[PDB]
Protein backbone atom coordinates (compact mmCIF):
# COMPACT_ATOMS: atom_id res chain seq x y z
CA UNK A 1 0.00 0.00 0.00
CA UNK A 2 1.18 3.59 -0.91
CA UNK A 3 0.53 5.16 2.60
CA UNK A 4 2.50 8.47 2.92
CA UNK A 5 6.16 7.90 3.98
CA UNK A 6 7.43 9.18 7.42
CA UNK A 7 10.60 11.40 7.33
CA UNK A 8 12.84 10.89 10.47
CA UNK A 9 15.84 13.31 10.77
CA UNK A 10 18.00 11.35 13.33
CA UNK A 11 19.92 14.45 14.60
CA UNK A 12 22.40 14.32 17.55
CA UNK A 13 20.68 17.24 19.40
CA UNK A 14 16.96 17.17 18.33
CA UNK A 15 15.07 14.51 16.23
CA UNK A 16 12.68 16.12 13.64
CA UNK A 17 9.75 13.80 12.63
CA UNK A 18 6.71 14.18 10.29
CA UNK A 19 4.84 12.85 7.19
CA UNK A 20 5.88 13.60 3.54
CA UNK A 21 4.05 16.69 2.11
CA UNK A 22 4.27 18.58 5.49
CA UNK A 23 6.00 22.03 5.09
CA UNK A 24 7.61 21.94 8.63
CA UNK A 25 8.35 19.04 11.08
CA UNK A 26 5.35 18.76 13.51
CA UNK A 27 7.25 16.80 16.27
CA UNK A 28 10.79 17.96 17.36
CA UNK A 29 12.19 16.57 20.70
CA UNK A 30 15.69 16.20 22.28
CA UNK A 31 17.61 12.95 21.41
CA UNK A 32 18.18 11.42 24.92
CA UNK A 33 16.45 9.07 27.48
CA UNK A 34 15.91 10.52 31.02
CA UNK A 35 15.55 8.03 33.96
CA UNK A 36 14.59 9.07 37.55
CA UNK A 37 17.70 9.05 39.87
CA UNK A 38 15.76 9.76 43.16
CA UNK A 39 13.69 7.10 45.09
CA UNK A 40 9.83 6.91 44.85
CA UNK A 41 8.17 7.18 48.35
CA UNK A 42 4.56 8.33 47.47
CA UNK A 43 1.73 6.13 45.98
CA UNK A 44 0.46 8.90 43.56
CA UNK A 45 3.99 9.74 42.20
CA UNK A 46 4.95 9.96 38.45
CA UNK A 47 4.63 6.49 36.75
CA UNK A 48 7.36 5.02 34.43
CA UNK A 49 11.21 4.92 34.58
CA UNK A 50 11.51 6.28 30.93
CA UNK A 51 10.79 9.98 30.01
CA UNK A 52 11.25 11.22 26.36
CA UNK A 53 10.66 14.74 24.88
CA UNK A 54 8.50 17.36 26.72
CA UNK A 55 7.85 15.11 29.82
CA UNK A 56 11.68 14.84 30.34
CA UNK A 57 12.12 18.65 29.76
CA UNK A 58 9.37 19.48 32.37
CA UNK A 59 10.63 16.94 35.01
CA UNK A 60 14.38 17.31 34.10
CA UNK A 61 15.63 17.71 37.74
CA UNK A 62 14.29 14.21 38.72
CA UNK A 63 15.88 12.46 35.66
CA UNK A 64 19.46 11.36 34.71
CA UNK A 65 20.10 12.26 31.00
CA UNK A 66 22.13 9.84 28.75
CA UNK A 67 22.55 10.44 24.95
CA UNK A 68 22.33 7.11 23.02
CA UNK A 69 24.12 8.48 19.86
CA UNK A 70 27.62 10.17 19.89
CA UNK A 71 29.19 11.75 16.71
CA UNK A 72 26.17 10.35 14.72
CA UNK A 73 26.99 6.72 15.85
CA UNK A 74 24.38 4.80 17.99
CA UNK A 75 26.28 3.57 21.13
CA UNK A 76 23.16 2.12 22.93
CA UNK A 77 20.72 0.46 20.42
CA UNK A 78 18.14 -0.51 23.15
CA UNK A 79 17.63 3.26 23.91
CA UNK A 80 17.66 4.18 20.13
CA UNK A 81 14.89 1.53 19.50
CA UNK A 82 12.72 3.11 22.31
CA UNK A 83 13.12 6.63 20.71
CA UNK A 84 11.86 5.31 17.28
CA UNK A 85 9.03 3.52 19.24
CA UNK A 86 8.25 6.99 20.80
CA UNK A 87 8.06 8.57 17.25
CA UNK A 88 5.17 6.10 16.43
CA UNK A 89 3.55 6.46 19.95
CA UNK A 90 0.41 8.55 20.90
CA UNK A 91 2.64 11.47 22.15
CA UNK A 92 4.32 11.95 18.68
CA UNK A 93 3.08 10.92 15.16
CA UNK A 94 0.52 8.23 16.44
CA UNK A 95 0.59 5.80 13.42
CA UNK A 96 1.38 2.07 12.76
CA UNK A 97 4.99 1.33 11.57
CA UNK A 98 3.62 -1.53 9.33
CA UNK A 99 1.46 0.92 7.21
CA UNK A 100 3.89 3.83 6.32
CA UNK A 101 7.34 3.66 4.60
CA UNK A 102 10.30 5.54 6.31
CA UNK A 103 13.01 7.98 4.98
CA UNK A 104 16.16 7.97 7.25
CA UNK A 105 18.93 10.69 7.00
CA UNK A 106 22.36 9.44 8.31
CA UNK A 107 25.73 11.31 8.28
CA UNK A 108 28.37 10.45 5.61
CA UNK A 109 31.36 8.03 6.14
CA UNK A 110 29.69 6.01 9.00
CA UNK A 111 30.69 2.34 9.68
CA UNK A 112 28.96 -0.38 7.53
CA UNK A 113 27.84 -2.26 10.74
CA UNK A 114 25.97 0.95 11.89
CA UNK A 115 23.62 0.96 8.80
CA UNK A 116 23.21 -2.90 9.00
CA UNK A 117 22.02 -2.89 12.69
CA UNK A 118 19.86 0.29 12.15
CA UNK A 119 18.18 -1.39 9.09
CA UNK A 120 17.59 -4.68 11.06
CA UNK A 121 15.44 -2.65 13.58
CA UNK A 122 13.14 -1.16 10.84
CA UNK A 123 12.73 -4.56 8.96
CA UNK A 124 12.86 -7.15 11.87
CA UNK A 125 11.74 -5.32 15.12
CA UNK A 126 9.44 -2.97 13.08
CA UNK A 127 7.72 -4.62 10.03
CA UNK A 128 8.10 -1.39 7.90
CA UNK A 129 6.92 -1.69 4.22
CA UNK A 130 10.06 0.07 2.78
CA UNK A 131 13.20 1.91 4.10
CA UNK A 132 15.35 4.46 2.12
CA UNK A 133 18.58 5.92 3.67
CA UNK A 134 19.59 9.36 2.19
CA UNK A 135 22.60 11.78 2.57
CA UNK A 136 22.16 15.01 4.65
CA UNK A 137 23.85 17.16 1.90
CA UNK A 138 21.66 15.86 -1.04
CA UNK A 139 18.39 16.59 0.92
CA UNK A 140 19.62 20.20 1.71
CA UNK A 141 19.83 20.79 -2.12
CA UNK A 142 16.11 19.73 -2.55
CA UNK A 143 15.19 22.16 0.33
CA UNK A 144 17.28 25.05 -1.19
CA UNK A 145 16.20 24.04 -4.77
CA UNK A 146 19.75 24.07 -6.32
CA UNK A 147 21.52 21.24 -8.30
CA UNK A 148 25.05 22.83 -7.92
CA UNK A 149 26.46 23.83 -4.48
CA UNK A 150 28.79 22.88 -1.54
CA UNK A 151 26.71 21.97 1.61
CA UNK A 152 28.66 22.69 4.88
CA UNK A 153 26.37 20.94 7.47
CA UNK A 154 27.90 21.71 10.95
CA UNK A 155 25.59 19.82 13.40
CA UNK A 156 25.70 19.21 17.21
CA UNK A 157 27.27 15.72 16.75
CA UNK A 158 29.30 15.92 13.45
CA UNK A 159 30.50 18.59 10.92
CA UNK A 160 30.93 17.49 7.22
CA UNK A 161 31.17 19.22 3.77
CA UNK A 162 29.90 17.46 0.54
CA UNK A 163 30.52 19.24 -2.82
CA UNK A 164 27.66 18.38 -5.32
CA UNK A 165 27.75 19.87 -8.91
CA UNK A 166 24.56 19.78 -11.14
CA UNK A 167 23.28 16.67 -9.24
CA UNK A 168 26.70 14.87 -9.23
CA UNK A 169 28.37 14.11 -5.82
CA UNK A 170 32.22 13.66 -5.71
CA UNK A 171 32.69 10.93 -3.03
CA UNK A 172 36.53 11.44 -2.67
CA UNK A 173 36.22 15.23 -1.84
CA UNK A 174 33.84 14.57 1.18
CA UNK A 175 35.50 15.77 4.48
CA UNK A 176 34.14 14.79 7.99
CA UNK A 177 35.40 16.00 11.47
CA UNK A 178 34.19 14.62 14.88
CA UNK A 179 34.32 18.10 16.62
CA UNK A 180 30.78 19.67 16.68
CA UNK A 181 28.30 21.77 18.80
CA UNK A 182 28.35 19.28 21.77
CA UNK A 183 32.20 19.69 22.07
CA UNK A 184 31.88 23.56 22.33
CA UNK A 185 29.34 23.08 25.23
CA UNK A 186 31.91 20.87 27.10
CA UNK A 187 34.71 23.42 26.24
CA UNK A 188 32.53 26.33 27.61
CA UNK A 189 31.85 24.25 30.82
CA UNK A 190 35.68 24.24 31.44
CA UNK A 191 35.65 28.12 31.38
CA UNK A 192 32.62 28.22 33.82
CA UNK A 193 34.62 25.95 36.26
CA UNK A 194 37.61 28.41 35.94
CA UNK A 195 35.17 31.28 36.86
CA UNK A 196 33.95 29.06 39.81
CA UNK A 197 30.53 27.62 38.71
CA UNK A 198 30.20 23.75 38.92
CA UNK A 199 27.68 21.88 36.65
CA UNK A 200 28.48 18.16 37.41
CA UNK A 201 24.86 16.83 36.90
CA UNK A 202 23.54 15.68 33.43
CA UNK A 203 20.57 18.13 33.91
CA UNK A 204 23.00 21.05 34.69
CA UNK A 205 24.92 20.42 31.37
CA UNK A 206 21.61 21.19 29.50
CA UNK A 207 21.58 24.66 31.24
CA UNK A 208 25.22 25.23 30.00
CA UNK A 209 23.94 24.43 26.42
CA UNK A 210 21.07 26.99 26.95
CA UNK A 211 23.64 29.63 28.24
CA UNK A 212 25.79 29.08 25.04
CA UNK A 213 22.69 29.48 22.73
CA UNK A 214 21.49 32.65 24.63
CA UNK A 215 24.85 34.52 25.14
CA UNK A 216 27.74 33.47 22.77
CA UNK A 217 29.15 35.58 19.83
CA UNK A 218 31.99 34.68 17.35
CA UNK A 219 34.84 37.31 17.36
CA UNK A 220 35.85 38.68 13.88
CA UNK A 221 39.42 39.36 15.27
CA UNK A 222 40.36 37.26 18.37
CA UNK A 223 43.40 39.48 19.35
CA UNK A 224 41.16 42.65 19.36
CA UNK A 225 38.41 41.11 21.60
CA UNK A 226 41.18 39.44 23.75
CA UNK A 227 42.79 42.93 24.36
CA UNK A 228 39.48 44.91 24.67
CA UNK A 229 37.57 44.65 28.05
CA UNK A 230 34.59 42.22 27.56
CA UNK A 231 31.01 43.14 28.73
CA UNK A 232 29.92 40.73 31.56
CA UNK A 233 26.46 39.59 30.26
CA UNK A 234 24.53 38.05 33.26
CA UNK A 235 22.40 34.85 32.79
CA UNK A 236 19.57 33.94 35.27
CA UNK A 237 19.39 30.22 36.35
CA UNK A 238 16.01 28.51 37.11
CA UNK A 239 16.49 29.16 40.92
CA UNK A 240 17.19 32.91 40.31
CA UNK A 241 21.06 33.01 40.63
CA UNK A 242 22.93 35.22 38.04
CA UNK A 243 26.21 34.14 36.26
CA UNK A 244 28.56 36.67 34.49
CA UNK A 245 30.00 34.79 31.42
CA UNK A 246 32.39 37.64 30.41
CA UNK A 247 35.37 36.77 28.10
CA UNK A 248 34.40 33.01 27.90
CA UNK A 249 31.46 34.10 25.60
CA UNK A 250 33.73 34.35 22.45
CA UNK A 251 36.59 32.02 23.66
CA UNK A 252 34.25 28.91 23.62
CA UNK A 253 33.03 29.08 19.95
CA UNK A 254 36.65 29.64 18.61
CA UNK A 255 37.13 25.78 18.96
CA UNK A 256 35.39 25.33 15.51
CA UNK A 257 38.23 27.30 13.75
CA UNK A 258 41.11 26.10 16.07
CA UNK A 259 40.73 22.44 17.23
CA UNK A 260 44.21 22.70 18.96
CA UNK A 261 42.38 24.65 21.81
CA UNK A 262 40.66 21.39 23.04
CA UNK A 263 43.92 19.62 21.91
CA UNK A 264 42.74 17.64 18.81
CA UNK A 265 45.26 17.18 15.89
CA UNK A 266 42.71 18.06 13.13
CA UNK A 267 41.99 20.84 10.53
CA UNK A 268 39.78 23.88 11.37
CA UNK A 269 36.14 24.10 10.06
CA UNK A 270 37.28 26.88 7.60
CA UNK A 271 40.04 24.52 6.22
CA UNK A 272 37.43 21.65 5.79
CA UNK A 273 35.24 23.81 3.43
CA UNK A 274 38.15 25.16 1.24
CA UNK A 275 40.12 21.81 1.18
CA UNK A 276 36.95 19.93 -0.02
CA UNK A 277 36.70 22.46 -2.96
CA UNK A 278 40.51 22.26 -3.69
CA UNK A 279 40.21 18.39 -3.97
CA UNK A 280 37.67 18.93 -6.86
CA UNK A 281 38.86 19.34 -10.54
CA UNK A 282 40.13 22.81 -11.70
CA UNK A 283 37.00 23.49 -13.89
CA UNK A 284 34.48 23.18 -10.97
CA UNK A 285 36.54 25.01 -8.21
CA UNK A 286 35.40 28.57 -9.26
CA UNK A 287 31.67 27.49 -9.43
CA UNK A 288 31.90 25.73 -5.97
CA UNK A 289 33.20 29.05 -4.41
CA UNK A 290 30.21 30.78 -6.18
CA UNK A 291 27.70 28.16 -4.80
CA UNK A 292 28.39 27.62 -1.01
CA UNK A 293 25.34 26.56 1.16
CA UNK A 294 25.54 26.78 5.03
CA UNK A 295 23.47 24.29 7.16
CA UNK A 296 23.44 22.79 10.71
CA UNK A 297 22.83 24.36 14.17
CA UNK A 298 26.53 25.33 14.83
CA UNK A 299 26.24 28.04 12.05
CA UNK A 300 23.73 30.07 14.23
CA UNK A 301 26.60 31.82 16.21
CA UNK A 302 26.55 35.69 15.90
CA UNK A 303 29.06 36.76 13.16
CA UNK A 304 29.55 33.13 11.90
CA UNK A 305 29.19 34.16 8.19
CA UNK A 306 31.50 37.23 8.62
CA UNK A 307 34.35 35.19 10.26
CA UNK A 308 33.91 32.15 7.90
CA UNK A 309 34.01 34.36 4.71
CA UNK A 310 37.22 36.10 6.02
CA UNK A 311 38.95 32.69 6.69
CA UNK A 312 37.74 31.14 3.33
CA UNK A 313 38.90 34.35 1.45
CA UNK A 314 42.48 33.94 2.91
CA UNK A 315 42.69 30.18 1.98
CA UNK A 316 40.77 30.58 -1.37
CA UNK A 317 42.53 31.69 -4.62
CA UNK A 318 43.00 35.45 -5.39
CA UNK A 319 40.27 37.41 -7.32
CA UNK A 320 37.56 34.65 -7.09
CA UNK A 321 33.85 35.49 -6.31
CA UNK A 322 32.88 33.77 -2.97
CA UNK A 323 29.05 33.78 -2.39
CA UNK A 324 27.93 31.95 0.85
CA UNK A 325 24.09 31.49 0.99
CA UNK A 326 22.44 30.72 4.41
CA UNK A 327 18.75 29.59 4.44
CA UNK A 328 16.78 31.30 7.32
CA UNK A 329 15.57 27.77 8.32
CA UNK A 330 19.15 26.44 8.71
CA UNK A 331 18.06 23.84 11.36
CA UNK A 332 14.97 22.56 9.41
CA UNK A 333 16.52 22.57 5.83
CA UNK A 334 17.55 18.84 5.94
CA UNK A 335 14.02 17.62 6.99
CA UNK A 336 12.29 20.00 4.43
CA UNK A 337 14.50 18.34 1.72
CA UNK A 338 13.37 14.90 3.02
CA UNK A 339 9.65 15.87 2.65
CA UNK A 340 10.31 17.18 -0.95
CA UNK A 341 12.28 14.00 -2.00
CA UNK A 342 9.72 11.66 -0.27
CA UNK A 343 6.75 13.39 -2.09
CA UNK A 344 8.23 12.40 -5.55
CA UNK A 345 6.82 9.33 -7.46
CA UNK A 346 10.48 8.33 -8.35
CA UNK A 347 10.86 7.60 -4.54
CA UNK A 348 8.92 4.29 -5.16
CA UNK A 349 11.96 2.91 -7.13
CA UNK A 350 14.46 4.49 -4.62
CA UNK A 351 13.44 2.71 -1.34
CA UNK A 352 14.07 -0.99 -0.40
CA UNK A 353 10.83 -3.02 0.30
CA UNK A 354 10.51 -5.38 3.35
CA UNK A 355 10.36 -8.45 0.99
CA UNK A 356 13.40 -7.08 -1.02
CA UNK A 357 15.46 -6.81 2.26
CA UNK A 358 14.38 -10.38 3.40
CA UNK A 359 15.63 -11.87 0.03
CA UNK A 360 18.98 -9.97 -0.50
CA UNK A 361 19.50 -8.65 3.10
CA UNK A 362 21.91 -5.82 4.12
CA UNK A 363 23.66 -5.86 0.65
CA UNK A 364 20.74 -3.86 -0.96
CA UNK A 365 21.23 -0.94 1.55
CA UNK A 366 25.08 -0.87 0.95
CA UNK A 367 24.58 -0.67 -2.90
CA UNK A 368 21.99 2.21 -2.68
CA UNK A 369 23.44 4.05 0.47
CA UNK A 370 25.39 6.66 -1.67
Amino acid sequence: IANQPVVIDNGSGVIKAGFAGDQIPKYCFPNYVGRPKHVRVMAGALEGDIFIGPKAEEHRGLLSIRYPMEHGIVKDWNDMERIWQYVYSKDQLQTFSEEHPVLLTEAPLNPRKNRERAAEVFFETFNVPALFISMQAVLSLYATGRTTGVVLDSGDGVTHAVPIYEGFAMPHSIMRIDIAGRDVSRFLRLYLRKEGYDFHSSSEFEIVKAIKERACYLSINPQKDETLETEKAQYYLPDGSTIEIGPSRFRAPELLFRPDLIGEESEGIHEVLVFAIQKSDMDLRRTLFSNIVLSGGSTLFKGFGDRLLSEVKKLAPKDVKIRISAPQERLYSTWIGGSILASLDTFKKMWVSKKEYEEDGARSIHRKTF
Partner: peptide, 24 residues
Protein backbone atom coordinates in the same frame (compact mmCIF):
# COMPACT_ATOMS: atom_id res chain seq x y z
CA UNK B 1 8.04 33.50 5.71
CA UNK B 2 4.90 33.42 7.93
CA UNK B 3 4.58 29.64 7.39
CA UNK B 4 7.98 28.77 8.87
CA UNK B 5 7.72 31.59 11.45
CA UNK B 6 5.71 29.30 13.82
CA UNK B 7 8.89 27.26 14.46
CA UNK B 8 11.14 28.17 17.45
CA UNK B 9 14.50 27.92 15.63
CA UNK B 10 14.13 30.55 12.94
CA UNK B 11 16.82 33.11 12.01
CA UNK B 12 15.57 36.73 12.25
CA UNK B 13 17.29 40.08 11.47
CA UNK B 14 20.17 38.36 9.64
CA UNK B 15 21.50 38.73 6.04
CA UNK B 16 20.61 35.84 3.67
CA UNK B 17 23.88 35.82 1.67
CA UNK B 18 27.50 36.58 2.60
CA UNK B 19 29.61 37.63 -0.45
CA UNK B 20 33.01 39.26 -1.23
CA UNK B 21 33.42 42.73 -2.81
CA UNK B 22 33.39 42.81 -6.68
CA UNK B 23 35.71 45.85 -6.70
CA UNK B 24 39.40 45.19 -5.71
Amino acid sequence: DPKYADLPGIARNEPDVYETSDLP
